[PDB]
Amino acid sequence: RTLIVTTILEEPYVMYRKSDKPLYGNDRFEGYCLDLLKELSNILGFLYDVKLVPDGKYGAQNDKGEWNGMVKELIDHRADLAVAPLTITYVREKVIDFSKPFMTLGISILYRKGTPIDSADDLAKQTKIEYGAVRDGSTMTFFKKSKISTYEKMWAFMSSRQQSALVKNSDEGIQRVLTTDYALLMESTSIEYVTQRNCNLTQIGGLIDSKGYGVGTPIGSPYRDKITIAILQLQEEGKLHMMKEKWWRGNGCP
Amino acid sequence: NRTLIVTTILEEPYVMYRKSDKPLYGNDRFEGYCLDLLKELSNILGFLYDVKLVPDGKYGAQNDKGEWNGMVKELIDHRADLAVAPLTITYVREKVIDFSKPFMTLGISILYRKGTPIDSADDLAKQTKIEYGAVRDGSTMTFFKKSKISTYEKMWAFMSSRQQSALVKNSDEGIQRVLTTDYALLMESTSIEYVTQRNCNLTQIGGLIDSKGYGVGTPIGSPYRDKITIAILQLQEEGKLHMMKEKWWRGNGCP
Ligand SMILES: O=C(O)C1=NO[C@H]2CN[C@H](C(=O)O)[C@@H]12
Ligand SMILES: O=C(O)C1=NO[C@H]2CN[C@H](C(=O)O)[C@@H]12
Ligand SMILES: [Cl-]
Numbered sequence: 001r002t003l004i005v006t007t008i009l010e011e012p013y014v015m016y017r018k019s020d021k022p023l024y025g026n027d028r029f030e031g032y033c034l035d036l037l038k039e040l041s042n043i044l045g046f047l048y049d050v051k052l053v054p055d056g057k058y059g060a061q062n063d064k065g066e067w068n069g070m071v072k073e074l075i076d077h078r079a080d081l082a083v084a085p086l087t088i089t090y091v092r093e094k095v096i097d098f099s100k101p102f103m104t105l106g107i108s109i110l111y112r113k114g115t116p117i118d119s120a121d122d123l124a125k126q127t128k129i130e131y132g133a134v135r136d137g138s139t140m141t142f143f144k145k146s147k148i149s150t151y152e153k154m155w156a157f158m159s160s161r162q163q164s165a166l167v168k169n170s171d172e173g174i175q176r177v178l179t180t181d182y183a184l185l186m187e188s189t190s191i192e193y194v195t196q197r198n199c200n201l202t203q204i205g206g207l208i209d210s211k212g213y214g215v216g217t218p219i220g221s222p223y224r225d226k227i228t229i230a231i232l233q234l235q236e237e238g239k240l241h242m243m244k245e246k247w248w249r250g251n252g253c254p
Numbered sequence: 255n256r257t258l259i260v261t262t263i264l265e266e267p268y269v270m271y272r273k274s275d276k277p278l279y280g281n282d283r284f285e286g287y288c289l290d291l292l293k294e295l296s297n298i299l300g301f302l303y304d305v306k307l308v309p310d311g312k313y314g315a316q317n318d319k320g321e322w323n324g325m326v327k328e329l330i331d332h333r334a335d336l337a338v339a340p341l342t343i344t345y346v347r348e349k350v351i352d353f354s355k356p357f358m359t360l361g362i363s364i365l366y367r368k369g370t371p372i373d374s375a376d377d378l379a380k381q382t383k384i385e386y387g388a389v390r391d392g393s394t395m396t397f398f399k400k401s402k403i404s405t406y407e408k409m410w411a412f413m414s415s416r417q418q419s420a421l422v423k424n425s426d427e428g429i430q431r432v433l434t435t436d437y438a439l440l441m442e443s444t445s446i447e448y449v450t451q452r453n454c455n456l457t458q459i460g461g462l463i464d465s466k467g468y469g470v471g472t473p474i475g476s477p478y479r480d481k482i483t484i485a486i487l488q489l490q491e492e493g494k495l496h497m498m499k500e501k502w503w504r505g506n507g508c509p
């Protein structure tokens with residue numbers, strides 16, 4: 001009756017609490033996803049045990065078709081729920097059962113302020129400004145699988161040179177934008193979090209696609225629909241809005 | 255191979271009667287965003303469909319006894335397999351039918367005339383000279399009726415006062431009311447985009463006061479819900495949904 005909740009460390013969704021003493025259990029973590037899990041447990045009346053995904057990954061396929069990360073943790077029934085910024089994608093939805101999105105978003109561009117670049121097209125036209133994304137993320141997979149002309153050109157550019165334009169994680173990409181002439185294709189929510197923490201950065205263009213974060217469950221989970229209903233209840237009460245406002249308030253950049 | 259029954263409703267630009275020099279029959283009678291959507295979804299899933307207009311012409315709401323009407327009831331009673339329409343995903347509805355994931359995200363916002371000091375819903379709750387309201391018994395109204403936020407509670411009181419004189423029957427009547435008088439219509443953002451592209455004196459005020467989506471409705475336990483979700487995600491990543499919305503929403507330009 002105690003659910004196992006797989007998750008992953010990512011600001012401001014799930015983070016280690018800064019503590020002067022050792023912490024244990026769910027008390028180790030804080031962030032948007034912990035508040036969310038608290039509200040969901042309050043609505044549905046279940047106990048949860050938060051476990052970090054061992055390989056520290058969200059979930060992707062290799063050439064052989066095998067999965068990793070939280071997705072694999074759900075497929076193998078080693079976790080009941082996955083409460084994380086887990087992007088709802090076509091390939092993932094076929095192997096796990098997502099709840100309806102608790103947060104909508106889209107891919108956009110993270111770049112430094114004061115440049116003539118205003119769209120993804122302006123990036124696809126030139127090569128002086130390097131651009132890319134995190135390796136093996138849904139953002140990257142969009143460009144890898146996209147058949148749109150512009151995004152095909154951008155994908156070609158990212159792949160050339162042994163994938164030198166891709167970064168391993170979000171932090172590395174942000175530092176590459178702040179140090180060099182680089183633009184990071186990133187999900188809009190993370191961009192909102194960053195541009196309010198470091199005022200040298202801004203979002204370029206709008207959203208190139210629309211998607212959402214959903215709570216992951218294994219196929220056939222009786223909790224998928226109940227969690228969908230709980231998320232809708234929390235959205236109509238305005239509680240999700242309060243949680244995002246709580247965790248996205250930072251330095252306040254002009 | 256059975257032909258699925260698709261309940262729907264007449265609403266611009268989702269489902270509309272074609273203009274024709276001759277009588278039309280079957281699915282050939284209708285056109286709009288939702289028909290294109292059905293065409294692509296069948297193209298992916300390979301099912302035949304038969305479009306039926308919901309008899310009572312309503313989306314779906316509860317009465318005093320808790321009984322449903324509209325497309326929602328049509329799905330509950332299994333007189334239809336799918337409901338392809340701008341059917342807002344709500345808490346109360348999700349408990350009686352199985353929604354697919356949203357094929358279009360949106361939120362409640364304000365439709366008003368341009369060049370006014372009003373910039374938010376708060377500016378409306380502060381005053382009473384500018385009357386404001388919503389469509390009767392729609393999800394937008396129910397938001398304010400059930401909301402526990404101070405501002406939206408005040409707004410709901412305003413809408414309800416005077417035997418609900420601030421509420422409109424349908425979207426068209428409300429739009430005409432904004433175009434003729436000093437009235438602001440609380441409306442879903444997608445429809446507002448549809449209006450502001452065709453009436454250049456009008457605009458959206460503020461942002462979205464909440465977040466929701468339109469989903470394809472199916473009865474609880476429907477084996478088609480998950481496959482339709484997957485098809486919708488496939489269509490979003492290919493940019494098909496974006497192209498369809500662009501097709502039916504851009505109506506020339508406002509200079
Ligand atoms: O791809 C991106 O932009 C991502 N950044 O962090 C993760 C949040 N959701 C995405 C996923 O599930 O793959 C990952
Ligand atoms: O509430 C609104 O703004 C609405 N306008 O038309 C309908 C579209 N979805 C809502 C519903 O499902 O009730 C209705
Ligand atoms: Cl769903």
Ligand SMILES: [Cl-]
Pocket residue numbers: 344345346347392393396
């Ligand atoms: Cl409702």
